[PDB]
Design an enzyme around this catalytic site. Structure first.
Site, PDB file in Angstrom:
ATOM      1  N   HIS A  62       0.792  -1.224   0.000  1.00 50.25           N
ATOM      2  CA  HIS A  62       0.000   0.000   0.000  1.00 50.25           C
ATOM      3  C   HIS A  62       0.824   1.274   0.000  1.00 50.25           C
ATOM      4  O   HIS A  62       0.284   2.327  -0.361  1.00 50.25           O
ATOM      5  CB  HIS A  62      -1.000   0.032   1.168  1.00 50.25           C
ATOM      6  N   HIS A  92       6.951   6.984   5.233  1.00 49.55           N
ATOM      7  CA  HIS A  92       6.326   6.588   3.982  1.00 49.55           C
ATOM      8  C   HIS A  92       5.587   7.803   3.434  1.00 49.55           C
ATOM      9  O   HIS A  92       5.476   8.841   4.094  1.00 49.55           O
ATOM     10  CB  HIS A  92       5.352   5.431   4.187  1.00 49.55           C
ATOM     11  N   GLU A 104      -3.333  13.306   2.426  1.00 44.52           N
ATOM     12  CA  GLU A 104      -4.392  12.849   3.326  1.00 44.52           C
ATOM     13  C   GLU A 104      -4.985  14.020   4.106  1.00 44.52           C
ATOM     14  O   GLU A 104      -6.180  14.304   3.998  1.00 44.52           O
ATOM     15  CB  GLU A 104      -3.818  11.790   4.262  1.00 44.52           C
TER      16      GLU A 104
HETATM   17  C1  LIG Z   1       1.850   1.939  11.291  1.00 47.46           C
HETATM   18  C2  LIG Z   1       1.487   3.403  11.263  1.00 47.46           C
HETATM   19  C3  LIG Z   1       1.608   4.188  12.402  1.00 47.46           C
HETATM   20  C4  LIG Z   1       1.285   5.533  12.383  1.00 47.46           C
HETATM   21  C5  LIG Z   1       0.844   6.120  11.215  1.00 47.46           C
HETATM   22  C6  LIG Z   1       0.718   5.361  10.058  1.00 47.46           C
HETATM   23  C7  LIG Z   1       0.342   6.030   8.777  1.00 47.46           C
HETATM   24  O1  LIG Z   1       0.636   7.201   8.563  1.00 47.46           O
HETATM   25  N1  LIG Z   1      -0.311   5.286   7.888  1.00 47.46           N
HETATM   26  N2  LIG Z   1      -0.612   5.792   6.603  1.00 47.46           N
HETATM   27  C8  LIG Z   1       1.034   4.004  10.098  1.00 47.46           C
HETATM   28 ZN   LIG Z   2       0.704   7.504   6.359  1.00 43.48          ZN
END
Ligand SMILES: Cc1cccc(C(=O)NN)c1
Ligand SMILES: [Zn+2]
EC number: 4.2.1.1
Length: 258
Positions: A62, A92, A104
């Site tokens: 993803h 990411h 987002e």
């Molecule tokens: C595993 C984790 C922890 C905190 C934020 C996220 C994220 O920004 N997801 N898109 C993912």
């Molecule tokens: Zn994220």
């Protein structure tokens, strides 16, 4: 069936497997700059990345995660709205199929081309798994990307993406310096929220920088050549891997600046 960003498994479906998708502290949100309040008690953000140890870059189906050694206080976030010390574990991005969407969080409903998330966990809980059982377990630094001039510190990331095209592929990725992804200013908005991917846990102090970074069209074009699918499966381009804004409900967004 598995959660994703397509028509049949995208954000509007997630609540069936992760009911907290309709919870009271979900992310992302729209940042209404005329409702966020300057808070003079907020401290400057302290970004201490001088000893950061990156290890690996992973296509997880993803996004792609750049992972860090979090066994010591090598790369930490302190200050700002935070109490205590938060260790960097991974970063990411989220991006669009077109430059007009991809972030987002939004700012007065404006969507940026992409958004960077640097994920940190509160060291008083000992590890990441325990941190995501707490309401103050995580701090995520969010940075908007707009298309303009190239970002030199992003190019090493761009150049390794050919080697992790499909889900499950990883590559060694040492000596990457995340300071090269920061804008000039560390002024920020902050609010309590969640992971924006399943399991959508409500553990995050969000710190979203006011100033976007500029990346070139070619840089984000290379993001869009990644694949959601694994090798040997039908090719699905990794684009539009963003969750839309969720209801703010009973939350306040605070600004570090006026
Ligand atoms: C595993 C984790 C922890 C905190 C934020 C996220 C994220 O920004 N997801 N898109 C993912
Ligand atoms: Zn994220």
């Amino acid at each position: 069936h598995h959660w994703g960003y397509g028509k049949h498994n995208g954000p509007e479906h997630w609540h069936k497997d992760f009911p907290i998708a309709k919870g009271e502290r979900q992310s992302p949100v729209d940042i209404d700059t005329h409702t966020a309040k300057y808070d003079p008690s907020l401290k400057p953000l302290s970004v201490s990345y001088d000893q950061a140890t990156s290890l690996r870059i992973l296509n997880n189906g993803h996004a792609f995660n750049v992972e860090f050694d979090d066994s010591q206080d090598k790369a930490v976030l302190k200050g700002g709205p935070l109490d205590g010390t938060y260790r960097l574990i991974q970063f990411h991005f989220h991006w669009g199929s077109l430059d007009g969407q991809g972030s987002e969080h939004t700012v007065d409903k404006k969507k940026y081309a992409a958004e960077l998330h640097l994920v940190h966990w509160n060291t008083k809980y000992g590890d990441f798994g325990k941190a995501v059982q707490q309401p103050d377990g995580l701090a995520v630094l969010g940075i908007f990307l707009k298309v303009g001039s190239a970002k030199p510190g992003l190019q090493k990331v761009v150049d390794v993406l050919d080697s992790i095209k499909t889900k499950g592929k990883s590559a060694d990725f040492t000596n990457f310096d995340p300071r090269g992804l920061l804008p000039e200013s560390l002024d920020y908005w902050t609010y309590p929220g969640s992971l924006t991917t399943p399991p959508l846990l409500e553990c995050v102090t969000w710190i979203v920088l006011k100033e976007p970074i500029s990346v070139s069209s070619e840089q984000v074009l290379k993001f869009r050549k990644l694949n959601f699918n694994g090798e040997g499966e039908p090719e699905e381009l990794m684009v539009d891997n963003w969750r839309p804004a969720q209801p703010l409900k009973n939350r306040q967004i605070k600004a570090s600046f006026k």
